[PDB]
Amino acid sequence: XXXXXXXXXXXXXXXXXXXXXXXXXXXXXXXXXXXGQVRLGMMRHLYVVVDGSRTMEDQDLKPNRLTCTLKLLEYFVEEYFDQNPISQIGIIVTKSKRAEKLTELSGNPRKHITSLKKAVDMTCHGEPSLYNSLSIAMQTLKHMPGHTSREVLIIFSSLTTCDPSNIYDLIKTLKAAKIRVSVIGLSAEVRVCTVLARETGGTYHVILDESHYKELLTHHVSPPPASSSSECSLIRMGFPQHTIXXXXXXXXXXXXXXXXXXXXXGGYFCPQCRAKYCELPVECKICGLTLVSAPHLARSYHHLFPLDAFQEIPLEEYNGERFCYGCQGELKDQHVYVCAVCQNVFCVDCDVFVHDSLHCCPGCIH
């Protein structure tokens, strides 16, 4: 009731500035990113199980937990389809001791984000059911092929995990069915989700803030490394070229579509069944082939020959290269970042840009 005494003063002219700068510096933090030269699960049928519990309506977040969770899942679907194109998502809301396959396992963000914009309007009545949700996710994820790192992400809030049967035989089955389940938890640590996470192979985490929860979902965007158990197969792939209406439709093949459609003149075929698809990449609806344009293999090549660390040094320190090798600007701050191989000079803006978006050192290309 006396927080007003948190503001001290020594000279009081820049001392209130020092207290405000200490507070504003203590109101921020940096992320923790991990590097690996290890095998990753790059075809990735992930399957999101959201709570629809009573505890979703609690107001620990700035809106209630349903709204914030659903907003960050909209961001999650966006960044996951932005970074892994082959993969798919399916969304289950778990509600009233039963599980509901809200959006089936598909690979385009339009249907999922449309369903989340719908699912803002829900009710969140009852206690969850981890049994039935893992059962529906298992039931769909039995028969995906063995090289797929089949992954479930349970955004789980409440504590009473109201199952209708025994949920250690599910964990033994899902251990044998080489699935991988990771739970992001709200407000607590629950022993059953801990056993599920450490036994199926996943990772369990509990949420402080908006920013920490964004860091956790960003941690689950990237393809997680594989165990010594998952099959390393060789999936047969198809690379259909784009085909416009051939020569002003001189002996074309006028089709409707293949999944309220208009008359398609041309587009993408299939090299297996010779059907008609508008969008690529799409799993072949009548063959079982997977269809790839092949920058969609190049969109996720940075995981395989990855980045390295920047040697971060704040001080002045021998810098005979005053200008940024990134964008030709002066280093007006005390943070200078130097690469490993070429050992050029980069600033903070070039650091965040290279390590988040461009994914390569501009020096090592030269």
Any contact of residue 354 with Zn ion (CB under 5 A)?
Answer: no
Find which of another protein, Zn ion, none residue 6 binds, CB within 5 to 8 Å per kind.
none
Give the contact letters, 295-334, x = binds to Zn ion (CB under 5 A), - = no: -----------------------------x-xx-------
> Minimal CA–CA distance to 45: which of 108, 101, 87, 91?
87
Any contact of residue 38 with Zn ion (CB under 5 A)?
Answer: no
Find which of another protein, Zn ion, none residue 354 binds, CB within 5 to 8 Å per kind.
another protein
What b/e sequence results for 159-179 when a residue is b if at least 16 CB atoms lie within 10 Å of its CB, and e otherwise?
bebbbeeebeebbeebeeebb
Q: Which is nearer to another protein, 117 or 302 (CB)?
A: 302
Other beta carbons less than 10 A from residue 4's beta carbon: 6
3-state secondary structure of 287: coil
Any contact of residue 270 with Zn ion (CB under 5 A)?
Answer: yes
Give the contact letters, 225-264, x = binds to Zn ion (CB under 5 A), - = no: ----------------------------------------
Other beta carbons less than 10 A from residue 119's beta carbon: 17
Any contact of residue 336 with Zn ion (CB under 5 A)?
Answer: no
3-state secondary structure of 206: strand
d(CA 234, CA 314): 47
- Chain-centroid distance, C-alpha 322: 38
Q: Which region, judged by CB under 5 A, interacts with Zn ion, from 3-11, 196-204, 311-319, 347-355?
A: 347-355
d(CA 366, CA 356): 20
Q: Which region, judged by CB under 5 A, interacts with Zn ion, from 39-47, 58-66, 216-224, 353-361?
A: 353-361
State how far the alpha carbon of 232 is from the alpha carbons of 174, 226, 228, 229, in Å: 19, 10, 10, 9
Find which of Zn ion, another protein, none residue 245 binds, CB within 5 to 8 Å per kind.
another protein
CB of 42 to Zn ion, least distance (A): 10
Find which of Zn ion, another protein, none residue 342 binds, CB within 5 to 8 Å per kind.
Zn ion
Q: Which is nearer to Zn ion, 298 or 342 (CB)?
A: 342
